[PDB]
């Protein structure tokens, strides 16, 4: 499939140690399996096993997630296609760590990416590297919005109130596309401007949370990079390729209809991915804002990836199984024997 579904388990953490929680998740990257202990202390043997396209255990470094998951997708984006990577899972399991990452406790400027850097900085690093290394005329722009309770908020506009809702227009160029009027798109001339853009977005997220209770754990974040590529033929024709990569940090998978329409928006996304995997005619793109925004990138002739993030702690057994169930319903991968 052009649809890859992978699972990442993060290390057991302090908040989980506090509660005398036990470790219940075992990852087998070679067999691409996740086994979860299902019986608690009274039955430590019973387990439930899932199989995915890739499995990343607690020791997985950021660079290996990038190389395994993003590199093939970025290669297609650079050929002029529109792709999407999602991070899905319970709050606190590592969607933002995977999507954004963290920087060095030492502030010194380096050109290599931080070992803790996530998909977003690494993607921008490789875009500028790949395209400078082969002499292509190119420009890069990025946008960052937040979907909270089915409403769209611009996280990068320097000059508008973050609480101003954004409207979606039809796109006369493409029946699959949408134009988000007023969405700030910032040109990136060098790999480092990305870090300043992520800081601006983080400040806007805090304001949105203070103003509207639009907490990032309850919102879908959509970081979109658009690469505009130009080559001039021998006889002087300018050919334009346009690649787009959407890096989506979904709302936590765990009010009411605030929380309800979170679950419905995520279920709609799940139904879209399942229909794309099964090649069924009815893909419900139009039934949520998230899938409307991403419809032009999800069509079928592109690579899509879902990184399902989970906790290894007994405290989160129910949501871990719910996340694995969601990932398995998105793409039915059967268990091998022995
Ligand atoms: N693979 C990992 N290794 C080390 N720390 C992690 C990992 N994944 C998540 N964390 C840490 O766990 C905390 C919660 O992760 P976060 O990305 O905020 O979860 P989410 O975005 O899914 O709510 C953060 O402090 C983050 O640094
Ligand atoms: Mg997060």
Swiss-Prot record:
Q: Where in this chain does the record put each Kinesin motor domain?
A: 2-333
GO function term, MF aspect, one: protein kinase binding
Q: How is it modified after translation?
A: A subset of this protein primarily localized at the spindle pole is phosphorylated by NEK6 during mitosis; phosphorylation is required for mitotic function.
Biological process per Gene Ontology, one example term: microtubule-based movement
Positions of post-translational N6-acetyllysine modification: 130
GO cellular component terms attached to this protein's record: ciliary basal body; cytosol; intracellular membrane-bounded organelle; kinesin complex; membrane; microtubule; mitotic spindle; nucleus
| Residues bound to ATP | 89-96
Q: Which residues cross the membrane?
A: none
Its annotated compartments are: Cytoplasm; Cytoplasm, Cytoskeleton, Spindle pole
The UniProt keyword set, sorted, is: Acetylation, ATP-binding, Cell cycle, Cell division, Coiled coil, Cytoplasm, Cytoskeleton, Disease variant, Isopeptide bond, Microtubule, Mitosis, Motor protein, Nucleotide-binding, Phosphoprotein, Ubl conjugation
- Record function comment: Motor protein required for establishing a bipolar spindle and thus contributing to chromosome congression during mitosis. Required in non-mitotic cells for transport of secretory proteins from the Golgi complex to the cell surface.
Under the subunit heading, UniProt states:
Interacts with the thyroid hormone receptor in the presence of thyroid hormone. Component of a large chromatin remodeling complex, at least composed of MYSM1, PCAF, RBM10 and KIF11/TRIP5. Interacts (via C-terminus) with the kinase NEK6 in both interphase and mitosis. Interacts with RARRES1 and AGBL2. Interacts with TPX2.
> What is the disease in the record?
Microcephaly with or without chorioretinopathy, lymphedema, or impaired intellectual development: An autosomal dominant disorder that involves an overlapping but variable spectrum of central nervous system and ocular developmental anomalies. Microcephaly ranges from mild to severe and is often associated with mild to moderate developmental delay and a characteristic facial phenotype with upslanting palpebral fissures, broad nose with rounded tip, long philtrum with thin upper lip, prominent chin, and prominent ears.
Q: Which family does it belong to?
A: Belongs to the TRAFAC class myosin-kinesin ATPase superfamily. Kinesin family. BimC subfamily.
| Protein known as | Kinesin-like protein KIF11
Q: Which residues of the full protein are shown?
A: 17 to 364 of 1056
């Amino acid at each position: 499939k052009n649809i890859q579904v992978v699972v990442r388990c993060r290390p057991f953490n302090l908040a989980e140690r506090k509660a005398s929680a036990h470790s219940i998740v075992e990852c087998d990257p070679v067999r691409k399996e996740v086994s979860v202990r299902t019986g608690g202390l009274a039955d430590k043997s019973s387990r439930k096993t899932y199989t995915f396209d890739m499995v990343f255990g607690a020791s997985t470094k950021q660079i290996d997630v990038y190389r395994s998951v993003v590199c093939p997708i970025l290669d297609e984006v650079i050929m002029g296609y529109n792709c999407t990577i999602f991070a899905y899972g319970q709050t606190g399991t590592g969607k933002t760590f995977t999507m954004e990452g963290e920087r060095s406790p030492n502030e010194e400027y380096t050109w290599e990416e931080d070992p803790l850097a996530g998909i977003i900085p690494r993607t921008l690093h490789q875009i500028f590297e790949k395209l400078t290394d082969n002499g292509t005329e190119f420009s890069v722009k990025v946008s960052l919005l937040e979907i909270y309770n089915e409403e769209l908020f611009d996280l990068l506009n320097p000059s508008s109130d973050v609480s101003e809702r954004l409207q979606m227009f039809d796109d006369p160029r493409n029946k699959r596309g949408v134009i988000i009027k007023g969405l700030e798109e910032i040109t990136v001339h060098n790999k480092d401007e990305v870090y300043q853009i992520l800081e601006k977005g983080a400040a806007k997220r805090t304001t949105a949370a203070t103003l509207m209770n639009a907490y990032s754990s309850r919102s879908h974040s959509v970081f979109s990079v658009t690469i505009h590529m130009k080559e001039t033929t021998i006889d002087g024709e300018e050919l334009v390729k346009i690649g787009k990569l959407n890096l989506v940090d979904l709302a936590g998978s765990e009010r009411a209809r605030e929380a309800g329409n979170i679950n419905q928006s995520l279920l709609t996304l799940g139904r879209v991915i399942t229909a794309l995997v099964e090649r069924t005619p009815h893909v419900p793109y139009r039934e949520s804002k998230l899938t409307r925004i991403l419809q032009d990138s999800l069509g079928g002739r592109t690579r899509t990836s879902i990184i399902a993030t989970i906790s290894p702690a007994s405290l989160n057994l129910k949501e871990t199984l719910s996340t694995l169930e969601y990932a398995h319903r998105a793409k039915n991968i059967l268990n091998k024997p022995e």
